[PDB]
Amino acid sequence: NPTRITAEPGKQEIIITREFDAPRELVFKAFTDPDLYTQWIGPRGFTTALKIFEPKNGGSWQYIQKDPEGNEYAFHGVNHDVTEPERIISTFEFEGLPEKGHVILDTARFEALPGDRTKLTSHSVFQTIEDRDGMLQSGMEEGINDSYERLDELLEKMKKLEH
Amino acid sequence: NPTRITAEPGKQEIIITREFDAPRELVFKAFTDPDLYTQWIGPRGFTTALKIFEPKNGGSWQYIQKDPEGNEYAFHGVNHDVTEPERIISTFEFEGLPEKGHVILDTARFEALPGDRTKLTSHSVFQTIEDRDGMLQSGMEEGINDSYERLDELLEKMKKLEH
Numbered sequence: 616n617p618t619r620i621t622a623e624p625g626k627q628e629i630i631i632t633r634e635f636d637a638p639r640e641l642v643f644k645a646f647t648d649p650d651l652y653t654q655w656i657g658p659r660g661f662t663t664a665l666k667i668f669e670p671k672n673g674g675s676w677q678y679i680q681k682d683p684e685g686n687e688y689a690f691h692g693v694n695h696d697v698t699e700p701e702r703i704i705s706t707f708e709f710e711g712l713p714e715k716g717h718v719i720l721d722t723a724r725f726e727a728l729p730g731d732r733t734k735l736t737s738h739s740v741f742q743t744i745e746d747r748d749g750m751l752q753s754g755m756e757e758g759i760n761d762s763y764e765r766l767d768e769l770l771e772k773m774k775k776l777e778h
Numbered sequence: 779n780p781t782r783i784t785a786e787p788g789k790q791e792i793i794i795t796r797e798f799d800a801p802r803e804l805v806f807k808a809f810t811d812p813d814l815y816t817q818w819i820g821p822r823g824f825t826t827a828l829k830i831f832e833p834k835n836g837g838s839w840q841y842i843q844k845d846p847e848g849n850e851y852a853f854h855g856v857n858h859d860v861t862e863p864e865r866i867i868s869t870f871e872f873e874g875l876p877e878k879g880h881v882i883l884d885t886a887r888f889e890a891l892p893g894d895r896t897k898l899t900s901h902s903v904f905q906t907i908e909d910r911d912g913m914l915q916s917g918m919e920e921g922i923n924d925s926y927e928r929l930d931e932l933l934e935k936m937k938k939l940e941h
Binding site for chain 1: 836838858865871882904905
């Protein structure tokens with residue numbers, strides 16, 4: 616399944632679409648179950664440990680990732696809306712930036728497809744076009760691809776466990 | 779003090795700048811004190827009652843406004859960051875829309891000016907350009923002007939009470 620990424624020049628947003636060979640109920644769970652989230656999130660070779668994780672309206676979340684060397688990357692946000700298995704809307708901040716205040720609004724939409732499949736549409740809206748650009752420069756398009764691949768593998772395990 | 783509003787066509791954001799004749803400490807308080815917030819928020823002739831109000835990182839907020847007739851308008855969001863007296867970042871959703879999922883990310887910046895004055899820069903980033911456009915069509919530029927005027931009056935009372 617291809618990971619389509621739209622990042623038009625001059626715009627302060629990024630849209631990503633990606634399908635999964637599993638029902639959105641399972642995909643949504645991979646997003647809201649603490650023990651599952653850490654197994655696919657982040658780029659390959661990275662480790663993720665959760666500090667706070669509240670997959671509900673008004674809940675906060677915060678995790679720290681470690682590269683295959685020891686470097687740490689801390690992130691946090693708050694969930695505006697978590698409606699199973701429709702969507703998740705929350706803020707996102709990378710604490711490793713020199714200046715504070717650069718916050719992104721993420722909207723993840725989960726739609727059922729024929730054959731009990733799922734189409735995920737992630738919408739990232741940035742503070743400014745440069746913030747959007749800086750994100751892409753950080754090899755985000757690569758990391759996103761890895762995580763989704765990690766998710767494919769996890770979904771298979773979940774499906775196997777199913778029946 | 780003029781209320782400058784930038785809403786470039788083709789963009790999914792809106793920037794508003796406005797100065798106040800009071801220290802940002804006082805202005806920030808008008809934003810975080812429950813008993814003060816309801817006295818200036820919303821357009822003229824409107825009444826605002828709070829349901830939840832947590833002016834802190836990870837806090838949720840929710841209020842209902844009534845027009846000078848009886849109509850109700852419900853809104854809610856979550857605060858990503860509340861750092862006194864620097865800024866406030868939070869989500870914003872109008873529950874009166876027919877479709878759910880239209881959420882805005884607001885960033886309010888408070889900067890001190892010469893003469894113990896304040897410059898407030900509000901940044902509204904919408905899901906899509908149409909959402910941004912629809913907001914403006916709702917006479918938002920008018921309501922914002924009213925609220926800021928109501929705030930001017932409230933700030934004077936706060937300053938009088940000061941010394």
